[PDB]
Enzyme design. Structure first.
Site, PDB file in Angstrom:
ATOM      1  CG  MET A 129      -2.048  -1.009   1.166  1.00 34.17           C
ATOM      2  SD  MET A 129      -3.152  -0.850   2.582  1.00 34.17           S
ATOM      3  CE  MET A 129      -4.436  -2.017   2.146  1.00 34.17           C
ATOM      4  CG  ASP A 130      -0.090   4.110  -2.984  1.00 35.62           C
ATOM      5  OD1 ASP A 130      -0.850   5.022  -2.596  1.00 35.62           O
ATOM      6  OD2 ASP A 130      -0.409   3.291  -3.870  1.00 35.62           O
TER       7      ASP A 130
END
Ligand SMILES: CCCCCCCCCCCCCCCCCC(=O)OC[C@H](COP(=O)(O)OCCN)OC(=O)CCCCCCCCCCCCCCCCC
Ligand SMILES: CCCCCCCCCCCCCCCCCC(=O)OC[C@H](COP(=O)(O)OCCN)OC(=O)CCCCCCCCCCCCCCCCC
Ligand SMILES: CCCCCCCCCCCCCCCCCC(=O)OC[C@H](COP(=O)(O)OCCN)OC(=O)CCCCCCCCCCCCCCCCC
Ligand SMILES: CCCCCCCCCCCCCCCCCC(=O)OC[C@H](COP(=O)(O)OCCN)OC(=O)CCCCCCCCCCCCCCCCC
Ligand SMILES: CCCCCCCCCCCCCCCCCC(=O)OC[C@H](COP(=O)(O)OCCN)OC(=O)CCCCCCCCCCCCCCCCC
Ligand SMILES: CCCCCCCCCCCCCCCCCC(=O)OC[C@H](COP(=O)(O)OCCN)OC(=O)CCCCCCCCCCCCCCCCC
Ligand SMILES: CCCCCCCCCCCC(=O)OC[C@H](COP(=O)(O)OCC[N+](C)(C)C)OC(=O)CCCCCCCCCCC
Ligand SMILES: CCCCCCCCCCCC(=O)OC[C@H](COP(=O)(O)OCC[N+](C)(C)C)OC(=O)CCCCCCCCCCC
Ligand SMILES: CCCCCCCCCCCC(=O)OC[C@H](COP(=O)(O)OCC[N+](C)(C)C)OC(=O)CCCCCCCCCCC
Ligand SMILES: CCCCCCCCCCCC(=O)OC[C@H](COP(=O)(O)OCC[N+](C)(C)C)OC(=O)CCCCCCCCCCC
Lengths: 64, 95, 491, 506, 28, 205, 169
Positions: free
Chosen positions: B41-42
């Site tokens: 996840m960014d």
């Protein structure tokens, strides 16, 4: 250490714990709960008194 | 009446279900599963998951906690410590 | 000149100890001198109070007439009539004698609060002594249950590890049962308007009502002797209560049930007592036989002594319910003898062994005669006294109680003779183990019986031997009083 | 005296400035008013003159020797209660200022005292409805006197609804009697006691049974007493029973004229259930006021057995029991308020929250009272042993006289049950005593510098500063010794009960 | 050879008390 | 010659032979069974309406759950009460009166019949123990004289002159046995032989 | 594999009753959590059928996890403000135990009666007992489906319970 404890402190403690646990759940602040009990007691006036023992047996049945 | 009824296992179980509705890398999620590495996840994907987890448990992560949370277990710990039932009207309780 | 002096002096004694010890309690952070040496000067005053209480009854004993029928020293106090006869006189003396003995037993084996303990002990001794000299059922019940409040706190404060369970047992067993006795007392006050001893003895009630009254009274009595199957509280209380509490409980309290039969059942419910006699014998015989066999399997040292008291008092109940003078006198003799030997066994077990090793398990003790010869001498002698060996007062009480039982019921009363064998089975098995084989590997060598413990054992042994060899000291006082309790119509 | 002085206090309280000191001094003014009321009532009302019974105010009120005794008891017990709010109970501002915060505290009490005294005197069904609402409304206001407390307002809401239903039942019973007969005066109704539906009076008693927390209507009473502040619970759990039970005895006295056996069985059925709930209910509880609420229910059941019998011995039993129970009730709550100074201060597990309204809320908060204050602990022990019924305390004679009336009138089942209930209730009674003293020898060598009393500053380090104020400690000392030493004057007190007549005469 | 005395149970369940084969210490 | 045993039984009004018109067991039991079933069934449907009136209010639901009965209870309770009414009346007719033995049997059997319906998921011995406990309570209820002795109480006896208000007189001996609450100074020797019998000190040694 | 369908039918039926009657929220959380675990059982154990024994192990795994969580919370305190997290775990075990006992299998008492003779024999035929492995070798882990009516996990935990009682050292 056997039957005299069942008919003694150990047996009565289990009986007391079972009965007192039921009574602890009957005490809570609720208008609908207390209202129904008051209205239910009006049946004692209506019912003929010869039915009191049948009510007494019914009450014990609900404790279970 | 107004008390938490959550458990560590139920909170973890529902946390995994929410996170499996996204495009995470792995479907094997536990307490030690990290958002950045294991889930891939960014910045924006992580914040989408955090808000989605907020909706499930009706809790709001604070700014400091949300900007420093790393693992799913930290999310589970936050939910257990901070969750409260929403106050009801006067009629719901006493009636 | 008796109850008035006894209550007033002891109340003044209670106030005196309270004023001295509680004067500096006002967060003074003080040291004071009364508290030096474990409150020695406060224990000494309480010990002196117990001794003076004995002298009070001795002054009235000088004027006692053994040839006079009826109550003597009749006195009005607190709107209550008090009197003394032959049976009451001896039981009062036993209660007051155990006063100093109970206090001396816990002289330096309490963790603290000696003043509270001393006041509680003296209060219990007086309350139990007053219960023998009251002349009505209501006054009998008031003193019968007033001792519960000091005793409940005494066990719960100075007790052993399971003191909490023991305090609940003594409070609830002895109150729930005594309330059934109160119902019979209330019935007397309703239909006769009085509970006076003399007044109710002359009234004949219906055979059905006497059955109801007997059952209500006997429930309170049977729990207090105690009798099977309402006996389970006693072993728990003895195994946890302090030594002084055990002495009073074993030496006085259990004798109130026998005295209760004399006052509340025999002269007022005479017709129904004859009918209930076979039932009482069956319960007491089974109580005697079962308790002896149960004692064989016990591992707690103090519990073994507790069960031994149950078997002996079963003989007392058998003797006192015999409708002849031999059984009645023997039951009273055995109560006095048990009042000395039974506390001594607790002193040997719970006061000498426990105060040194603090463990009541039997597996830790054997071969104690190697390094404790003085202890073993008293242990063996008191073991033979407890088993009914002659030259001891227990033998005189047991033989006459057994003989009176056979006279009352030749067939089933003969079973009371099993006490001669059964009592020796559990008592000697304990004594044979404690003295036989090599010295225990779990014990360190320490002091033998000290002077204070020697004094307690000697002055409990002396009355037993005197009564055993010359029981006429006791029989002469009892003969006229005991002859009134017999119900028979020979034509 | 009450009515005239109440109006003056109402105006004076609203004129002077709002302060804790003025409120406390106004509370002392209310104490003088009740004392003056007692002196005036004792001057004109005597036991001998009122034996016949005297009608008042167009026969709307009827006073006899039985009624007069309760009125004197009501005034006396109210005097002891005002002492709590008229003086210090702990000496600490953080605790004691709650009683001085509400100015209308003394005003509402004076309103309720008027209702309490007039209720046993009612001789008309119209004034019966008026007075019972006057007493009921004053109790609702007192329950809600602390309007900043969530529990106090919640309890008053519960109290209002349950009592209003009971008032409706009472009104419904009186209206049904008027429909059958057309008469409103009780003495006129007694002329037709054999021609009216006697179960309509049972409907009237059902409304009165609700107001005293009798089973099956016990639940609301336990909830209200536990939630309300200790200073409020002390009043609302005792005062309503003083007047309503006396009125129930009068109504049962009229009912026994026709001697309806079916009526007795229904009341016996409710007494039987109340003894079961009263005994087993308090076995598993952790709150002290919840425990006392079950204790209150059980003791009311014992008095109802005397009331149900309704004989000469019942008058002796009821009058003695109600007097001694009130003194024990005051003594226990007085000790509970004081001993809050020995509570440890945190400096956590179970996250226990204790508020200023109920500083003592759990039974285990009474731990180590034997060490903290030996004289106060023994005073509580004497009171508890009285509730148990240990002779020769006041409690034993109360149960002794109740058993006499019950067994004389043939209530064998209830007498045996009341004694089994007494043994069961002894379990939770002994638990209080276990908490006080059973750990004395292990905690004797302990250090407590964190107690509430330790926060009180010293004056000069040389003054002997007592831990408790003069008035409240003296009241506890007096009540404890009266309970303990009742055997000294028991014979004369019962002789006084012999002379209390309810139309017996000869 | 040796055998156990009578009335010695083969099994027992006293909660968590250890369960060991009954042994007559006289025969050691 | 029967054994001489104590009789701890409270006084009861007796009906002479030819009295005690029997009770219709079927009609009396049917009224209880039908009446209980309608009320328990009627209240069950009414409580269902309360559930539908609102199901998002926790306070209402908590109290409704306590009063709610399962289907077995709604069937078991009328049957147990109906069986109790039948057996109590049936056993009373056999003995020409109501006794604690008959009420113990009627209560224990009826409770066991009911317990087997709504307590199926329990051991049979568990239901027997409760049935014995329930039967013993109602046997004690009958032994104590129901809720009141009525005209057999001391107050009733005192009003009728059967009490002890007039004192006692040893010079007057009554051949007939005294009342239950009546006390006497001296009794006939024949009555003592009736109560105890000859033997251990009565008449003979 | 029909008992599992019958057992799962009750679980879903109870959830409808809990929601309709507004019953305990915790019970609703318990049932919804079991259906989540049961969903994994359907996916993982596909093509291998679904017997009650795998359902028993599924419920047993949930019970021990909550007990392990409760054992830590009751010692170190609960994190929630009302300190109810530890007690919530115990209350959820009761619900799962209720469904665990409803399964048509033998109870622990019967298994203890069928394993103790094996445990006693190992001690008697070897003198001393040191590990439960020697007990496992004599257990027929192929026919315990109708004879003992127990599962693999049920037998494995029972042997450990008896081994701790019967361990010499
Ligand atoms: C000096 C002034 C002292 C009081 C004088 C007085 O008149 O009190 C009455 C009584 C003195 O005796 P008297 O008047 O002759 O009549 C017998 C009544 N006891 O004196 C007394 O009655 C005082 C008695 C106080 C002690 C009673 C405490 C009871 C102890 C617990 C009860 C135990 C027994 C039950
Ligand atoms: C450690 C040892 C402790 C003690 C162990 C037990 C021993 C004590 C109890 C055993 C009995 C002791 C002796 C009692 C019998 C003495 C009476 C007798 O002489 O027996 C015969 C007698 C019948 O006399 P008879 O003249 O024939 O009657 C004519 C009536 N028209 O009367 C009879 O009919 C006999 C009565 C029946 C026999 C009863 C004996 C059985 C007792 C069993 C107790 C439980 C074991
Ligand atoms: C304040 C105590 C004042 C006591 C006054 C008692 C009283 O009201 O009179 C007795 C009353 C019957 O009186 P009566 O028959 O009508 O007329 C004759 C009066 N000599 O009889 C009664 O009805 C009174 C019933 C209540 C008895 C209360 C007993 C006193 C309560 C303990 C007082 C504690 C004092 C604490 C002091 C606090 C201040 C430091
Ligand atoms: C020799 C000395 C003798 C001294 C003692 C004399 C009295 C002895 C009394 C013996 C009876 C009690 C002892 C045995 C009861 C044991 C209770 C018990 O085991 O559990 C409670 C039971 C439910 O069983 P459970 O909770 O599942 O426990 C597991 C059982 N396998 O719960 C139940 O099902 C019980 C039945 C429901 C409750 C019924 C209550 C009705 C009233 C009972 C009588 C109370 C009378 C009180 C009178 C005063 C108050 C009115
Ligand atoms: C549950 C089962 C518990 C035991 C059943 C009750 C046993 C009670 C009993 O002693 O039997 C009485 C009962 C018959 O009732 P009964 O009053 O004796 O009728 C007159 C017959 N001559 O006998 C039975 O009906 C059985
Ligand atoms: C059909 C209408 C409803 C029946 C009438 C009820 C009102 C009259 C009863 C008087 C007592 C009022 C108690 C409060 C009302 C009861 C409300 C109720 O029914 O709740 C049921 C309650 C909880 O039961 P629970 O199993 O935990 O929850 C069910 C979930 N499925 O279960 C209970 O615990 C309730 C039982 C309370 C205990 C009462 C015991 C009274 C005394 C009985 C024994 C008599 C004592 C003397 C015995 C010897 C007599 C000779
Ligand atoms: C025959 C009629 C007697 C009645 C009155 C007896 C005295 C009452 C107590 C007042 C004085 C007091 O509370 O003082 C306390 C005294 C002294 O103990 P302490 O170690 O110095 O105290 C501790 C202080 N230290 C640690 C600083 C030294 O101990 C007592 O409590 C003993 C008497 C009570 C025993 C029984 C209690 C229950 C009674 C129930 C009645 C049914
Ligand atoms: C007619 C002759 C009557 C004789 C006396 C009757 C039995 C007395 C039992 C002692 C109880 C006790 O001591 O109360 C204390 C015991 C404590 O139990 P514990 O020992 O700590 O073990 C149990 C605790 N556990 C499991 C945690 C280890 O709590 C009870 O049991 C509570 C119920 C007692 C009610 C007694 C009412 C009796 C009614 C009257 C008779 C019908
Ligand atoms: C340690 C625990 C102790 C428990 C209490 C023990 C008490 C023993 C009493 C037994 C009495 C007995 O067996 O009496 C015997 C009587 C039988 O006499 P019958 O047939 O009427 O007449 C006999 C006439 N023949 C010989 C011509 C036939 O039996 C009963 O009627 C028992 C009623 C009460 C049972 C309980
Ligand atoms: C102890 C009392 C023993 C009485 C035996 C009895 O009453 O016997 C048992 C009775 C049967 O008697 P029945 O069939 O009514 O009459 C007998 C036949 N008649 C009509 C010819 C006389 O039934 C029962 O189990 C009733 C329950 C017993 C409860 C006892 C409670 C006692 C409390 C303490 C009171 C002070």
């Amino acid at each position: 250490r056997g039957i005299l404890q069942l008919f003694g402190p150990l047996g009565l403690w289990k009986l007391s714990t079972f009965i007192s646990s039921k009574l602890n759940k009957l005490v809570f602040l609720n208008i609908g709960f207390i209202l129904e009990i008051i209205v239910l007691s009006w049946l004692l006036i209506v019912f003929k008194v010869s039915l009191l023992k049948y009510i007494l047996l019914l009450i014990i049945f609900i404790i279970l | 009446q107004s008390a938490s009824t959550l458990t560590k296992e139920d909170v973890l179980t529902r946390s995994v279900s929410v996170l499996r509705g996204f495009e995470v890398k792995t479907k094997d999620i536990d307490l030690q599963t990290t958002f950045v590495q294991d889930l891939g996840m960014d910045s924006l994907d992580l914040n989408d998951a955090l808000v989605a987890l907020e909706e499930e448990f009706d809790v709001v992560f604070d700014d400091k906690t949300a900007n420093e949370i790393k693992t799913v277990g930290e999310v589970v710990d936050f939910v257990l410590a901070n969750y409260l039932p929403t106050e009801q009207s006067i009629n719901h309780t006493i009636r | 000149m008796l109850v008035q002096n006894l209550i007033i002096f002891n109340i003044i004694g209670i106030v005196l100890l309270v004023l001295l010890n509680n004067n500096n309690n006002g967060i003074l952070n003080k040291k004071s001198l009364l508290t030096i040496k474990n409150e020695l000067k406060l224990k000494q005053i309480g010990l002196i109070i117990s001794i003076i209480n004995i002298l009070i009854i001795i002054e009235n004993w000088i004027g006692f007439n053994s040839n006079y029928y009826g109550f003597q020293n009749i006195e009005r106090f607190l709107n209550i009539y008090w009197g003394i006869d032959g049976i009451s006189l001896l039981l009062v003396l036993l209660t007051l004698i155990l006063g100093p003995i109970a206090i001396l037993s816990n002289w330096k084996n309490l963790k603290g609060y000696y003043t509270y303990y001393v006041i509680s002990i003296n209060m219990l001794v007086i309350l139990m002594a007053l219960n023998f000299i009251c002349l009505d059922l209501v006054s009998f019940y008031i003193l019968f249950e007033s001792t519960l409040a000091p005793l409940f706190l005494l066990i719960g404060i100075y007790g052993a590890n399971n003191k909490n369970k023991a305090a609940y047992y003594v409070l609830i067993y002895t109150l729930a049962s005594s309330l059934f006795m109160l119902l019979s007392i209330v019935i007397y006050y309703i239909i006769i308007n009085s509970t006076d001893y003399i007044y109710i003895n002359n009234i004949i009630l219906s055979i059905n009502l006497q059955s109801l009254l007997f059952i209500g009274i006997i429930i309170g009595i049977a729990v207090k002797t105690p009798l099977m199957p309402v006996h389970t509280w006693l072993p728990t209380v003895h195994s946890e209560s302090p030594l002084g509490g055990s002495i009073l409980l074993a030496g006085v309290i259990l004798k109130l049930a026998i005295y209760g039969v004399i006052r509340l059942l025999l002269p007022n419910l005479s017709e129904i007592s004859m009918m209930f006699t076979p039932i009482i014998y069956i319960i007491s015989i089974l109580t005697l036989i079962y308790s002896s066999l149960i004692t064989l399997k016990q591992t707690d040292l103090k519990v073994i002594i507790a069960y031994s008291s149950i078997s002996h008092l079963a003989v007392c109940m058998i003797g006192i319910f015999a409708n002849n003078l031999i059984g009645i006198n023997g039951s009273l003799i055995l109560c006095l003898a048990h009042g000395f030997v039974s506390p001594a066994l607790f002193i040997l077990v719970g006061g000498i062994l426990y105060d040194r090793y603090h463990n009541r398990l039997i597996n830790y003790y054997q071969g104690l005669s190697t390094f404790m010869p003085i202890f073993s001498i008293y242990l063996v002698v008191f073991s033979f006294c407890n088993t009914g060996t002659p030259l001891s007062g227990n033998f005189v009480g047991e033989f006459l109680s057994i003989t009176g039982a056979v006279i009352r019921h030749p067939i089933i009363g003969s079973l009371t003779a099993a006490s001669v064998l059964l009592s020796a089975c559990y008592q000697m098995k304990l004594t044979n183990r404690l003295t036989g084989s090599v010295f225990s590997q779990y014990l360190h060598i320490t002091n033998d019986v000290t002077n204070r413990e020697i004094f307690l054992l000697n002055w409990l042994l002396i009355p037993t031997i005197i009564i055993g060899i010359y029981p006429s000291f006791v029989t002469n006082i009892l003969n006229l009083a005991s002859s009134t309790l017999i119900y028979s119509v020979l034509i | 005296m009450l009515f005239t002085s109440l109006l003056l206090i109402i105006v004076y309280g609203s004129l002077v400035n709002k302060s804790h000191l003025l409120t406390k001094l106004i509370n002392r003014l209310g104490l003088i008013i009740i004392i003056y009321t007692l002196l005036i009532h004792l001057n004109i009302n005597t036991l001998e003159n009122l034996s016949i019974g005297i009608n008042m105010f167009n026969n709307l009120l009827l006073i006899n020797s039985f009624n007069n005794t309760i009125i004197e008891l009501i005034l006396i017990i109210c005097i002891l209660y005002v002492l709590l709010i008229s003086f210090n109970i702990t000496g600490l501002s953080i605790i004691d200022n709650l009683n001085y915060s509400k100015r209308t505290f003394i005003v509402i009490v004076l309103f309720n005292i008027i209702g309490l005294t007039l209720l046993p005197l009612v001789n008309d069904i119209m004034i019966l409805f008026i007075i019972i609402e006057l007493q009921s409304y004053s109790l609702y206001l007192l329950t809600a006197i602390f309007n900043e407390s969530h529990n106090s307002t919640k309890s008053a809401l519960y109290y209002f609804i349950v009592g209003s239903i009971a008032s409706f039942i009472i009104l419904d019973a009186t209206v049904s009697i008027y429909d059958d007969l057309g008469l409103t005066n009780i003495q006129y109704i007694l002329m037709y006691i054999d021609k009216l539906e006697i179960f309509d009076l049972l409907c009237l008693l059902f409304g009165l049974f609700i107001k005293i927390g009798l089973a099956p209507f016990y639940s609301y009473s336990i909830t209200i007493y536990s939630l309300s502040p200790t200073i409020i619970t002390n009043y609302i759990s005792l005062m309503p029973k003083l007047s309503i039970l006396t009125l129930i005895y009068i109504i049962m006295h009229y009912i026994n004229i026709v001697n309806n056996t079916d009526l007795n069985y229904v009341i016996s059925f409710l007494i039987l259930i109340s003894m079961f709930i009263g005994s087993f209910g308090g076995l598993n509880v952790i709150r002290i006021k919840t425990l006392l609420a079950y204790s209150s229910l059980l003791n009311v059941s014992y008095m109802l057995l005397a009331i149900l019998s309704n004989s000469n011995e019942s008058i002796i039993a009821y009058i003695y029991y109600i007097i001694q129970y009130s003194l024990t009730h005051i003594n226990i709550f007085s000790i509970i308020l004081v001993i809050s100074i020995y509570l440890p201060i945190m400096n956590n597990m179970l996250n226990v929250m204790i508020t200023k309204y109920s500083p003592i809320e759990y039974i285990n908060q009474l731990k180590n009272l034997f060490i903290n204050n030996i004289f106060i602990a023994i005073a509580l022990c004497i009171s508890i042993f009285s509730l148990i019924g240990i002779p020769p305390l006041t409690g034993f004679y109360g149960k002794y006289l109740v058993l006499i009336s019950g067994l004389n009138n043939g209530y064998v089942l209830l007498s045996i049950v009341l004694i089994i209930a007494s043994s069961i209730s002894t379990v939770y009674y002994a638990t209080i005593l276990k908490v006080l003293s059973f750990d004395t020898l292990s905690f004797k060598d302990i250090i407590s510098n964190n107690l509430i009393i330790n926060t009180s500053p010293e004056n000069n380090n040389n003054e002997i500063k007592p831990e408790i104020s003069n008035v409240i400690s003296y009241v506890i000392s007096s009540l404890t010794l009266i309970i303990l030493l009742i055997i000294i004057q028991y014979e004369n007190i019962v002789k006084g009960a012999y002379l209390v007549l309810l139309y017996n005469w000869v | 050879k040796s055998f156990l005395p009578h009335f010695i149970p083969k099994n027992y369940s006293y909660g968590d008390y250890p369960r060991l084969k009954p042994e007559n210490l006289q025969k050691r | 010659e029967q054994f001489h045993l104590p009789q701890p039984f409270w006084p009861t009004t007796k009906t002479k032979e030819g009295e005690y018109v029997p009770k219709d067991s079927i009609r009396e039991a049917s009224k209880v069974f039908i009446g209980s079933g309608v009320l328990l069934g009627g209240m069950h449907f009414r409580r269902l309406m309360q559930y539908k009136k609102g199901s998002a209010r926790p306070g209402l639901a908590k109290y409704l759950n306590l009063f709610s009965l399962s289907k077995s209870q709604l069937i078991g309770f009328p049957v147990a009460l109906g069986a109790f009414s039948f057996l109590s009346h049936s056993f009373a007719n056999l003995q020409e009166g109501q006794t604690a033995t008959g009420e113990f049997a009627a209560s224990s059997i009826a409770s066991l019949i009911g317990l087997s319906i709504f307590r199926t998921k329990k051991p049979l011995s568990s239901n027997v123990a409760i049935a014995v406990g329930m039967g013993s309570l109602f046997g004690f209820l009958t032994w104590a004289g129901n809720f009141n002795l009525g005209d057999n109480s001391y107050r009733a006896a005192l009003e009728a002159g059967n009490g002890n208000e007039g004192g006692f007189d040893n010079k007057v001996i009554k051949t007939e046995r005294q009342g239950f609450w009546e006390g006497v100074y001296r009794r006939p020797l024949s009555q003592t032989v009736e109560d105890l019998g000859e033997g251990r000190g009565i008449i003979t040694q | 594999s029909s008992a599992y369908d019958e057992a799962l039918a009750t679980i879903r039926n109870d959830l409808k009753l809990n929601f309709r009657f507004k019953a305990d929220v915790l019970e609703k959380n318990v049932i919804r959590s079991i259906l989540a675990e049961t969903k994994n059982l359907e996916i993982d154990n596909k093509d291998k059928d679904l017997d009650e024994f795998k359902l028993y192990d599924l419920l047993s795994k949930m019970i021990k996890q909550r007990q392990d969580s409760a054992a830590i919370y009751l010692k170190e305190g609960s994190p929630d403000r009302f300190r109810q997290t530890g007690w919530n775990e115990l209350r959820e075990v009761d619900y799962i135990t209720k469904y665990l006992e409803a399964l048509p299998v033998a109870s622990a008492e019967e298994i203890e009666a069928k394993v103790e003779p094996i445990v006693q024999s190992v001690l008697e035929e070897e003198g001393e007992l040191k590990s439960p492995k020697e007990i496992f070798s004599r257990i027929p882990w192929k026919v315990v489906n109708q004879d003992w009516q127990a599962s693999e996990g049920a037998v494995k935990n029972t042997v450990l319970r008896l081994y701790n009682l019967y361990k010499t050292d």
